[PDB]
Structure formats: C-alpha cells, structure tokens
Structure 1
Amino acid sequence: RKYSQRHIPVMVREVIEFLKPEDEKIILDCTVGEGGHSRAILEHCPGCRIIGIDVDSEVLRIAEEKLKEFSDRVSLFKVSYREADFLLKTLGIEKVDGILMDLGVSTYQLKGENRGFTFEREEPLDMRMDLESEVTAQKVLNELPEEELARIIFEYGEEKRFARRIARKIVENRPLNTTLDLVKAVREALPSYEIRRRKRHFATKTFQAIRIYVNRELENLKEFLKKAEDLLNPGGRIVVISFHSLEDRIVKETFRNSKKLRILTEKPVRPSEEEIRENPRARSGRLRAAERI
C-alpha cells in the first residue's frame, strides 16, 4: 500500500485561490469524485452553489454522504463533463462562474473498488471509472493489436523507449487476468538496472496508459477544453489539475491559444514538498488556471 487511506483533495489551497469561490458564484466541479474539493469550496463560501458530476456512480455515493451538510447548495449528477453543457441547460443554467477539473483517480477508486487501477494488490483488470461502459482493461490487454498497445503505452504511458517491448511482453503473457499479470509483463520488459533506476514503481506508466485508454481521458479532455470557455460568465475562472505531461501541455496550449481566456498560470503550480509525501495522489500534479475575458 502506497496511497494514503484517507482521501485528501489535491492542492486545495491553490484551487480556492484560483477559483475564487465567493458571494453567490455557481461552480461546476467536472470531476467531483468523493467530494473533496467541492466540500472545501462549500466550507469556504457559504453562498456558492455547486453542480458536481462524475461518471463513477460509486464515488458519487460517497460524495453525496460527505457533502450531506451542504445538500441544499450542491447537486450531484452522473454524466461525463463532455455533456456538462446540456446538463446545465436542463437545470436552467446557461453559464457558470467557475469550472474545476481534477484529472486523477480517487482514493476509493484506487483502494476500494477492486477494479485494478493500481497494483498494491491482486485485482481484476477492469479499470473502468464508469462500470456501465463495455471496454475493460482486460479486454484491451488481451485483444488489441500489438501495434496499438505499443502506441498506447508510448503516447499515454510516456514510455518513450520501452513501449514496444512492454507491448510485446503483454502479448506474450496473454491471457492476462489480474493486476499481477500486468505487473509481470512490464517486469519482463524492463532490465533490472532500469527498474532500479526509476523513482516510481516500474509498472506505474503502463497502468496509467491502459487506464487513460479505457476511460478516453485524453480525448474527453481535449474535446471539453475546446468549448469550456463558452460556459463561463465574464470574469469566470477555470482551474485544471493534471497528473500527466501530455494533459498539462494540452491545457496550457488551450488556455494560451484561446482568444476568450487569459491564462493566469504561465508556469504550472505544483504541490508543496509536504503535500506529496502526505498525499501520494498529488504526485505529478500540475495546476493551471485561466479567466474568461
């Protein structure tokens, strides 16, 4: 076990700082998860209203209980942020004052769902954040063409040197059934000196690659970012926390190139030294923010 047992919102102070919840602002929490950031916003601003969404019904159950004392000011929905625009319309809301995105994995997803998001223990290769979707990590690992697995591991895992060998070992280990089977494949692909050289556990990037693919995380982010600015009232703030270089690059470029947004963070805001050790889920976190102009 590496991740903390306690669920802690990443960079909550910086989120509050850039989102500026105050007065009676309406805030869209695009990845409400267990409600960590939303609870902090509601505690910080007595007049704000939050529309919180997620695709994982199980974490929404947790958020609904955690946010119980603020139930009159926060509402939760099971919907992809890609459809947040129409969700808001069905609620009679055309624009919001703040948009928050935390692109990681929740504590409960890592430790209690038994979906194989991580490898602290032997679990099925599922990795679906929305259990209603059909594609599982197992199906991807056992059926995708080897060249596509290589592409995924290179692009989403950022394995810039060993992507092809990892894909080869995955194919050689078929059929894979558990998280330990995937760890075995990655271990066989990397030389002992390479495993020892790495800071993070050697299977980290490959697990992340498959997760992103299964949950269309990169495609979803790119599509949402194209029009997120249209959901903001003048002066509105959009804050995004990513845990992947490619996602961060996409956010940075979107904010910079946008003619409707003024980037507020030319350089990414990163977690304090203490936070990282206290909250492993904060590892690799990069926060960017922009304002509607």
Structure 2
Amino acid sequence: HIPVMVREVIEFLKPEDEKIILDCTVGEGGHSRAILEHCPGCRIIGIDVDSEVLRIAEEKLKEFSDRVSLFKVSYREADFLLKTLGIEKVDGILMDLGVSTYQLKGENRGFTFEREEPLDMRMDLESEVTAQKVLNELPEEELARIIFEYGEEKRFARRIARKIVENRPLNTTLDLVKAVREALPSYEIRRRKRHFATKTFQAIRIYVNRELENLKEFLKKAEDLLNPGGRIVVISFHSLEDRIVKETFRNSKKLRILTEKPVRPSEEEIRENPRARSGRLRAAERI
C-alpha cells in the first residue's frame, strides 16, 4: 500500500520538533513512516484493530522502533490507551478511513468483489459479526436501510436487498456480486463509473465494522486530546463520512477549521496511489 496524499497530510499535521502524533488508523504504517522520516524528533502512537496489518507495520517501521509504538485498540479507546502510557494530550491526530490495500488484496476476507473469497469483512478477526451472517440473517428491511444509508444506493437499495435475500444462503464474494447484478438493469451497470457492486460491498463492510458510529463518537471528543495548536487531519472516501467530518469540525467550539473545502488528490497523486481517488482530506486546529 502507498500512503494517500502524504504531502497534504504532512502539510496539515505539521510534524516537527518533538511533537507526539496519534495515528488512529496506522494500517501498514505508510503515513507513520513518512512522518518519522520527515521529523526526527517526533513520537508516534499508532493503533489499529487489525492485528495482521499491525504485524506489517511493525516490520516496515523497524528502523524507527525507538520512536513509534503500536497497539491493537479501536481509536474509540485512544484516550485511555494514551493515559496508560502516561500521555494526556497529543500534538497531532491522523485518521485515514477505509480499507488498506493489503486488507483488500491479501487477507482473503472478502473486502473485494474482484475474486472469490469468503464473506468475512471483519477488520478485527476477533469480532463476532461477519458479512456472511449479516447477509444471510438480517431482516430484509434492515439490509435495505444499510445499503441505502451506508452504500448510498439512493434508488436501488430495496431491490438489492431483495436480491440478496433471494440469493440466500450467500457464501462468497461472487454470490454477493451475483445478487447486486440481478438487482441492477444492464443500462444502469454500464452507466456507472465504478464497478456496480462497489457501494453494496461498502455498505456491508461499514455495518460489520461499525465504521460510521465509531467515527462520529470519536470525532465528538477528539478535540479534548489535542494540545493548544494541535492538528487533526482526516481523510475520508465516503460522502457520508466526509459530511460527518465536515460537520463535526464546524460544530466544534474548540476547533478552528483549516480546510473549508475538502483537499482532493492531484491527478498525479491518483497515479501514485489509485486509492487516493474518492479521497477527501479535512484538517482542523485546536484553539
């Protein structure tokens, strides 16, 4: 995986001198490595809920092991993790939402619709709920709500939910693709820019990982973890996600928005990492 919009992350996070940075979604360690290379005196507390990517990050960040520490914990519990480390506040907070390319291409958890894999989609394999259980057992009306809300399928959510039910029991990513294909007319599939199953897969993933609920709850209080002048930078890839960030930054009384308009990748930043496409970066400062 290649770090998305690393230049803008560094620009807004302002890692310098001996700042302490909380990387809420360390993943394979891409952004963290860039920060450590850019700032020799900084310290990073990196967290993720996926132990498999933390293994990757620990090896990738080897050369900086004395200045970065990794932990398996949800950012919703970052406040107490910091306390157990003797840290009350940090100078920077970074969040890169979504899925790591390794999670997409190498974990065999069915995050992707491109190859046949089990319907798992858990970022934390220790959690109980799987995409398979959700798809095979949730009431049809709830599936419709999820696809409409998290998938943003504003016209076909009910029909996609109906096809999922008609295709039960589902077992692989290809079974889900089949359900979505049967729900969308040929002209609609062709009309779309991204693969037609993209939104439905996203909706199930977000539900399984409580991605929007976690983000909303964390961002409400994130400001309390920042030292004066501290920076919080978030990269979203979902309109509903970006809206939550935008709104949270706006409604905060302790944060001064630094990006009225979302910072987007340059056509070139897109090449250096096609994952950057759909990426919207927002930043704010503790005042």
* Same fold at TM > 0.5: yes
Instruction: List structure 1 runs of 4+ shifted beyond 3 angstroms.
Output: none
Give the distance between the partners of 1:69 and 1:27, measured in 2 at CA: 18
Query: What's the CA shift for 1:103?
Result: 0.3
Structure 2 residue matching 1:75: 3-state secondary structure? strand
Query: What's the CA shift for 1:97?
Result: 0.0
Give the distance between the partners of 2:277 and 2:155, measured in 1 at CA: 22
Give the distance between the partners of 2:175 and 2:27, measured in 1 at CA: 28
Query: What's the CA shift for 1:286?
Result: 0.3
- Residue by residue over 1:125-172, the C-alpha shift from the partner in whole angstroms, topping out at 9 and shown as x without a partner, is 000000000000000000000000000000000000000000000000
Query: What's the CA shift for 1:46?
Result: 0.1
Query: What's the CA shift for 1:278?
Result: 3.7
Query: What's the CA shift for 1:70?
Result: 0.1
Q: TM-score, normalised by structure 1?
A: 0.97
Structure 1 residue matching 2:95: 3-state secondary structure? strand
Structure 2 partner of 1:264:
258
- Answer yes or no: is the 8 Å Cα contact 2:90–2:226 preserved in 1: yes
Give the distance between the partners of 1:44 and 1:277, measured in 2 at CA: 22
- Structure 2 residue 149 is matched with structure 1 residue 165: no
- Residue by residue over 1:187-210, the C-alpha shift from the partner in whole angstroms, topping out at 9 and shown as x without a partner, is 000000000000000000000000
- Answer yes or no: is the 8 Å Cα contact 2:2–2:272 preserved in 1: no
Structure 2 residue matching 1:115: 3-state secondary structure? coil
Give the distance between the partners of 1:121 and 1:253, measured in 2 at CA: 37
Query: What's the CA shift for 1:283?
Result: 1.9
Give the distance between the partners of 1:263 and 1:36, measured in 2 at CA: 25
- Which 5+ residue runs of structure 1 have no aligned equivalent? 1-6
Query: What's the CA shift for 1:229?
Result: 0.1
User: Number of matched residues?
Assistant: 287
Query: What's the CA shift for 1:277?
Result: 3.5
Give the distance between the partners of 1:64 and 1:100, measured in 2 at CA: 18
1:97 to 69, 91, 105: 91
Structure 2 partner of 1:65:
59
- Structure 2 residue 75 is matched with structure 1 residue 55: no
Instruction: Output the aligned Cα RMSD.
Output: 0.5
Query: What's the CA shift for 1:280?
Result: 2.2
Structure 2 residue matching 1:15: 3-state secondary structure? helix
Structure 1 partner of 2:275:
281
Q: TM-score, normalised by structure 2?
A: 0.99
- Residue by residue over 1:211-260, the C-alpha shift from the partner in whole angstroms, topping out at 9 and shown as x without a partner, is 00000000000000010000000000000000000110010111011000
Structure 1 residue matching 2:262: 3-state secondary structure? coil
Give the distance between the partners of 2:29 and 2:113, measured in 1 at CA: 24
- Answer yes or no: is the 8 Å Cα contact 2:12–2:283 preserved in 1: yes
Give the distance between the partners of 1:201 and 1:249, measured in 2 at CA: 23
Query: What's the CA shift for 1:104?
Result: 1.3
Query: What's the CA shift for 1:279?
Result: 1.7
Structure 2 partner of 1:207:
201
